[PDB]
Amino acid sequence: MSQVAPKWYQSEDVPAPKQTRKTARPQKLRASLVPGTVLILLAGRFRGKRVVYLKNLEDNTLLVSGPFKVNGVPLRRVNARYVIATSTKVNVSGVDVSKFNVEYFAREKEIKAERVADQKSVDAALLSEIKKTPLLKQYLAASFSLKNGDRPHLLKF
Amino acid sequence: VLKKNPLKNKQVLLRLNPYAKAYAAEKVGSAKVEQAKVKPSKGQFAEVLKN
Amino acid sequence: ETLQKKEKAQQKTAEERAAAKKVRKAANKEKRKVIFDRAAAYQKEYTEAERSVIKAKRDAKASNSYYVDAQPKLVFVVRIKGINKIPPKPRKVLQLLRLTQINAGVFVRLTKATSELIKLAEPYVAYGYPSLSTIRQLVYKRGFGKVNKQRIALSDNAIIEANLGKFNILSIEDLIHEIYTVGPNFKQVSNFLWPFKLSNPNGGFRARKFQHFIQGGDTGNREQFINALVKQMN
Amino acid sequence: GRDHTSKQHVRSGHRTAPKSDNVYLQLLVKLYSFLARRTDAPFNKVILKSLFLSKINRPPVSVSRISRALKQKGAAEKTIVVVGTVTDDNRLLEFPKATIAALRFTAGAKDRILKNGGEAITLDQLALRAPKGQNTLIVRGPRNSREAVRHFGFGPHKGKAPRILSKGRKFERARGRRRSRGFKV
Amino acid sequence: PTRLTKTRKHRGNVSAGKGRIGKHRKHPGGRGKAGGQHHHRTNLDKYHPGYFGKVGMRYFHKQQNHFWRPEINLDKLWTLVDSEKKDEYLSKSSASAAPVIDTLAHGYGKVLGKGRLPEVPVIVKARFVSKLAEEKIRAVGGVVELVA
RNA sequence: AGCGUGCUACUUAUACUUCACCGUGAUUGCUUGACGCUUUCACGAGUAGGCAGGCGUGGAGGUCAGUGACGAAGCCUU
RNA sequence: UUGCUUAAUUGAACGUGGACAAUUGAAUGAAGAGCUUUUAGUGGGCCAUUUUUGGUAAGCAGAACUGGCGAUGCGGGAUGA
RNA sequence: GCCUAGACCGAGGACUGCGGUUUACCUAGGAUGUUGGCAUAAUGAUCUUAAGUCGCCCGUCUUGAAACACGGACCAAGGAGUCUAACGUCUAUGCGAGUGUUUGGGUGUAAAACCCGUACGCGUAAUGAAAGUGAACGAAGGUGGGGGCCCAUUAGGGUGCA
RNA sequence: GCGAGAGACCGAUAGCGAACAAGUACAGUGAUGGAAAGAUGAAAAGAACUUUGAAAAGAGAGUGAAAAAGUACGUGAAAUUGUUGAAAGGGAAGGGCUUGAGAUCAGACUUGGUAUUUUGCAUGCGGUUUACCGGGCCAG
Ligand SMILES: NC[C@@H]1O[C@H](O[C@H]2[C@@H](O)[C@H](O[C@@H]3[C@@H](O)[C@H](N)C[C@H](N)[C@H]3O[C@H]3O[C@H](CO)[C@@H](O)[C@H](O)[C@H]3N)O[C@@H]2CO)[C@H](N)[C@@H](O)[C@@H]1O
Ligand SMILES: [Mg+2]
Ligand SMILES: [Mg+2]
Ligand SMILES: [Mg+2]
Ligand SMILES: [Mg+2]
Ligand SMILES: [Mg+2]
Ligand SMILES: [Mg+2]
Ligand SMILES: [Mg+2]
Ligand SMILES: [Mg+2]
Ligand SMILES: [Mg+2]
Ligand SMILES: [Mg+2]
Ligand SMILES: [Mg+2]
Ligand SMILES: [Mg+2]
Ligand SMILES: [Mg+2]
Ligand SMILES: [Mg+2]
Ligand SMILES: [Mg+2]
Ligand SMILES: [Mg+2]
Ligand SMILES: [Mg+2]
Ligand SMILES: [Mg+2]
Ligand SMILES: [Mg+2]
Ligand SMILES: [Mg+2]
Ligand SMILES: [Mg+2]
Ligand SMILES: [Mg+2]
Ligand SMILES: [Mg+2]
Ligand SMILES: [Mg+2]
Ligand SMILES: [Mg+2]
Ligand SMILES: [Mg+2]
Ligand SMILES: [Mg+2]
Ligand SMILES: [Mg+2]
Ligand SMILES: [Mg+2]
Ligand SMILES: [Mg+2]
Ligand SMILES: [Mg+2]
Ligand SMILES: [Mg+2]
Ligand SMILES: [Mg+2]
Ligand SMILES: [Mg+2]
Ligand SMILES: [Mg+2]
Ligand SMILES: [Mg+2]
Ligand SMILES: [Mg+2]
Ligand SMILES: [Mg+2]
Ligand SMILES: [Mg+2]
Ligand SMILES: [Mg+2]
Ligand SMILES: [Mg+2]
Ligand SMILES: [Mg+2]
Ligand SMILES: [Mg+2]
Ligand SMILES: [Mg+2]
Ligand SMILES: [Mg+2]
Ligand SMILES: [Mg+2]
Ligand SMILES: [Mg+2]
Ligand SMILES: [Mg+2]
Ligand SMILES: [Mg+2]
Ligand SMILES: [Mg+2]
Ligand SMILES: [Mg+2]
Ligand SMILES: [Mg+2]
Ligand SMILES: [Mg+2]
Ligand SMILES: [Mg+2]
């Protein structure tokens, strides 16, 4: 621009940030999110898929299984804001989901042998409880879509 | 640097009015009144109804 | 080696500051107890006076009489008219009421002088009798003080004490009490308060503002509906 | 919009610095900018303000006025402060021993102060022996003896001096200054 | 310098500070002292009273050298005494030996009597003196000696 | 979807409320830049006109031991 | 105190000394009060409400107070000083 | 008192303050945590153009101009408050009851710089037509204010320039 | 008039009217009036020759540092105009704001750090790519 030289009093030190008081407090999920509830995925690859909710992970995401045999959607995480939580529920008191956490889904084609074995073991109990409710498998294996004249502000889920 | 409303920020409310804590503790905002069930208009105040 | 020199100096002065804050906070506790007691006494006398007036009304009803309420001593005045095309005398009157913008509010103690002042500003203002909660909400949300000619938020009782302690105002509740039940130092307390700058009403005005409240407009004395208006605008 | 009760964006109307670019005069204000900022002594705030004044606002102070100022009761050793030039007065019959602090001294003034046993110091030397202006006495020169003020506020029956280049009986003396030539104002 | 004048700041503004209605014209009101009795009467009467008319008597062939008579007051009279010898004189002057101050030789015609003299006899030589100047010189024990 | 009248909600000015940034005035403090740094508040329409702070040109004193035939100046160009 | 005034030791004006202390004698406000110098442009105006004169009246002519336009954009009156 | 949906914003930048829960921690003197994608690019700007909306030709005199008022077809270069004599206010500077070296003389590395002094101008006295006369009763005056300085000890007193 | 030395002056619409065959060309019966007009290049080396053409000329070629210097001559602006390319266009065109579309431009994998695979050089310096730490931007 111009011939104005920088001066000596124009320092280059970067100040430290002030001490912030934004201490995080835990997330509150919607009352409709109780483990075992069947959810509808709204975005992502598996959008429109009806899936079973299993556990609230500590990252604020939801652990979900298809089950993979019924749907092809595996055990994975979803965000609570991209899911419509219906009123259908599956008894997941008999499904052990303790070993699942954020590090389980840590970033490292093909699929780990541990994860496939866990998929089958979880899907066994989910399936055992799903068979009890008639058409629950058929419902979970079917994709969701809005028909003409479907008003989501008027529909019960 | 940033004005905070004491009617929204409880910490600022207690900073300005310490008695608000007692107001909250005693439910002064929903305090019942002890009195008898009376009706003192049975006589001449029924002149409101007609004349 | 300037690192350890400057670190030692802040930690020494930090410990000194910590000790000083301990003594200050211990001393400040008694003052906060004082203002706590003051607020409790004000609440008790408010409730007792209300119940006393209510009982007196019931008794007058019972005893074939009519309890005539004491006339209001305080009014809240809001300028709802813009700054253009104002005749000189009401313009001067509004300036002397510190109402120099639209949606500016001020507290007035009703005498005869101030009443005739408000009568001069009547076509341009909406005013009325404010409730205690309306006063508190105004002072808490939009209460500012005039300190060395600056508009400073009333965010701490120390500002109020430093400016109105010679008038026995040590808290925001002392100020609210002094305003509501018009006290011996109402003049100083209300002039220390910067004129309240309200927004437009949420819900709007009437269809046409600039006609008396009695004739379906907004100007003049609305008396107790100024509380609803302040709720709309504050 | 605002109904302004006063004019907006009004400068204070006072000098906040000398108009002079004399580097040594600004060093003295730098000393008294610090003194006015930090001593709470009213003397130092007056000196900082007086260093800003213009030439006509710093009239010369004769050494006779200081002599008359030293003749106040209980003032024989007060220190005289003149923010300006102290000039000599050859009409004095005698001068006392005195300490006078000034921006400038004329040759007659400096010789006469020192000849009579006194001191002629600058205002920075004052700020060390009297950083709060203790036991001082500020002397200001006559402001209204200036020639330009003779013509200020001229008008009929005002008694001021006309702005005129020549003086005599033929120069603005006939009509309006004499009843034999019409009127007098 | 032309660069500091307001002519440079008026460039770009139409009227150059002279007004759009009033405009800058050749000579509205006349030239010089025109109209001093008719439309500039209000100016000359207010600020230069006495301008019109004759007062007093004429003087054909006036030589100001005839009227040369510079004044020296009494409070400035001792400055004509030698500066290097003033202080001893202020002490040792008496009726028997007082300093002579030749005022004419310093360029003064009349000695006036403003101010106060040292309580010291002096001999003042002047062309003219006032009544009080000579009274003050005699009171301190001095004398005035007339010269030409 | 006209006339008189009542009611509920809604629409939107450079106006009002909260916030950001610019400038102006004031204001708090400050012992290798104090003609400087800093805290805070209020305010900002404008012809004629006044003042202030700046941008640009021919030439001049000083300086950059400044650029330049390995390309100055000028000229055209999302 | 006086050269003014009273029949006066009466008065007049200006004074010495003493008493009445912060509710020092209504309200509201006050980006503080007071003071000075110097100089520009301007010296065709017009409009609205109300008072109002001449005129049958006029988008006519003339006054009173205020507010405006002129000098001013913006939202509304479709459009319009 | 309690629950609940959305939008806009995130200025500041070690600590310092007021509070709350109890020499600890907090929501309490201004947004952080975490995850994904992108760095041949998501992101942003300009130019042209389309679309929506608004937008009358500038300058001028005028109460009033887009005017059916006047100049202007277009482009380049030139083009208009200057200098001088004498002055008013303000400001800076030097010296100061004085001040101004430059008419002139000296000198010179030669229209420069450096130096010199008698006079003279203005100032230091006014007033009267003029003859003329010509500025201290007093601490160069008194009273009411008056910054600053001094003695005090809220107050009060002393001294009080402009 | 003659002879000199200079300038904070002007720089070819300026400076005298004239920087040139300027008081010239030209006008007017006449007295008088009175311009425009400087720059190739260091040097003409001012383009031999061949070819097309009636010729001027054009095209090859040649000289030149440059012909993007050819006496139409340094640089060569704008108005105005031709061609090419891009685009728009129902009784104008032009403008502001906003975004789209196309074109252009900008920017952090930083002067990123650790080694490392692996290579050009003077044990060491520059590159490179894989890992980890961490960083930039846009977002949930
Ligand atoms: N001696 C008379 C004249 O003085 C002129 O010079 C005068 C001016 O240059 C200068 O003017 C000053 C002015 O600067 C200053 N700021 C105010 C002062 N009043 C003015 O002086 C003025 O008044 C005096 C009388 O008092 C007149 O003699 C003078 O002509 C007049 N200009 O003061 C000089 C005093 O005379 C010229 N040298 C010349 O015309 C002639 O000598
Ligand atoms: Mg609404
Ligand atoms: Mg504003
Ligand atoms: Mg005098
Ligand atoms: Mg008189
Ligand atoms: Mg004459
Ligand atoms: Mg008469
Ligand atoms: Mg006669
Ligand atoms: Mg201008
Ligand atoms: Mg202008
Ligand atoms: Mg123009
Ligand atoms: Mg002007
Ligand atoms: Mg004009
Ligand atoms: Mg004029
Ligand atoms: Mg005379
Ligand atoms: Mg309609
Ligand atoms: Mg209807
Ligand atoms: Mg805005
Ligand atoms: Mg402005
Ligand atoms: Mg030039
Ligand atoms: Mg130069
Ligand atoms: Mg070079
Ligand atoms: Mg170039
Ligand atoms: Mg004028
Ligand atoms: Mg005039
Ligand atoms: Mg007219
Ligand atoms: Mg006119
Ligand atoms: Mg006009
Ligand atoms: Mg307007
Ligand atoms: Mg409009
Ligand atoms: Mg209409
Ligand atoms: Mg930030
Ligand atoms: Mg676009
Ligand atoms: Mg339009
Ligand atoms: Mg015109
Ligand atoms: Mg006309
Ligand atoms: Mg026009
Ligand atoms: Mg027309
Ligand atoms: Mg006309
Ligand atoms: Mg005309
Ligand atoms: Mg034409
Ligand atoms: Mg033309
Ligand atoms: Mg002299
Ligand atoms: Mg004098
Ligand atoms: Mg006498
Ligand atoms: Mg020529
Ligand atoms: Mg010519
Ligand atoms: Mg040429
Ligand atoms: Mg041939
Ligand atoms: Mg070339
Ligand atoms: Mg060339
Ligand atoms: Mg060419
Ligand atoms: Mg072109
Ligand atoms: Mg057609
Ligand atoms: Mg784009």
Q: Are D118 and D99 in contact (CB under 8 A)?
A: yes
Across the beta sheet with A61-65, what order do the strands follow?
Answer: A76-79, A61-65, A50-56, A37-41, A83-89
Residue C152, beta-bridge partner list:
C145
CB contact under 8 A, D1 and C82: yes
Please give the backbone phi and psi of residue D120, each rounded to the nearest 5 degrees, phi first: -125, 95
D170 CA → I44 C1’, Å: 87
**Measuring from the CA of residue E24 to each C1', which nucleotide is nearest?**
H81
User: How far apart (Å, rounded) are the C-alpha atoms in residues E113 and E68?
Assistant: 19
User: How far apart (Å, rounded) are the C-alpha atoms in residues E16 and D168?
Assistant: 42
Q: Which nucleotides of I are covered by protein (CB under 7 A)?
A: 140
From the list A62, A64, A72, A52, the residue with the least C-alpha distance to A127 is A52
CB contact under 8 A, D178 and E50: yes
CB contact under 8 A, D3 and C95: yes
User: How far apart (Å, rounded) are the C-alpha atoms in residues C47 and B23?
Assistant: 13
Residue A40, beta-bridge partner list:
A50, A84
Residue B6, beta-bridge partner list:
none
Q: Which residues of B touch C56 (CB under 8 A)?
A: none
Alpha-carbon separation of residue D36 from A44, A90, D130 (angstroms):
71, 82, 13
Residue C108, beta-bridge partner list:
C75
What is the DSSP secondary-structure string of C38-85? HHHHHHHHHHHHHHHHHHHHHHHHHTT--PPPPPP-EEEEEE-S-SSS
Q: Tokens 């004000």 belong to which residue?
A: C42
Q: Which two tokens stand for residue C134?
A: 């309306």
Q: Are A72 and A45 in contact (CB under 8 A)?
A: no
Alpha-carbon separation of residue E29 from D104, E25, E40, E52, E61 (angstroms):
50, 10, 8, 19, 38
User: How far apart (Å, rounded) are the C-alpha atoms in residues D80 and D65?
Assistant: 11
User: Resolution, in Å, please?
Assistant: 2.9
D72 CA → G17 C1’, Å: 27
**Measuring from the CA of residue A79 to each C1', which nucleotide is nearest?**
I140
Q: Tokens 């002057």 belong to which residue?
A: E93
Give the pairing type, strands E100-102 and D119-121: unpaired
Tell me if chain C has a CB within 8 Å of the CB of D2: yes
From the list C176, C50, C142, C195, the residue with the least C-alpha distance to B17 is C176
User: How far apart (Å, rounded) are the C-alpha atoms in residues D65 and D143?
Assistant: 14
How far off is chain D from C58, nearest CA to CA, in Å? Answer: 49
Kindly report the number of other CB atoms within 10 A of residue A9's CB atom. 5
Q: Which nucleotides of G are covered by protein (CB under 7 A)?
A: 23, 26-32, 34, 36-38, 40-44, 66-68
A1 CA → I107 C1’, Å: 19
Residue of C36, C62, C154 with shortest CB distance to B40: C62
A81 touches strand I (CB under 7 A): yes
Tell me if chain B has a CB within 8 Å of the CB of C29: no
Tell me if chain C has a CB within 8 Å of the CB of B49: no
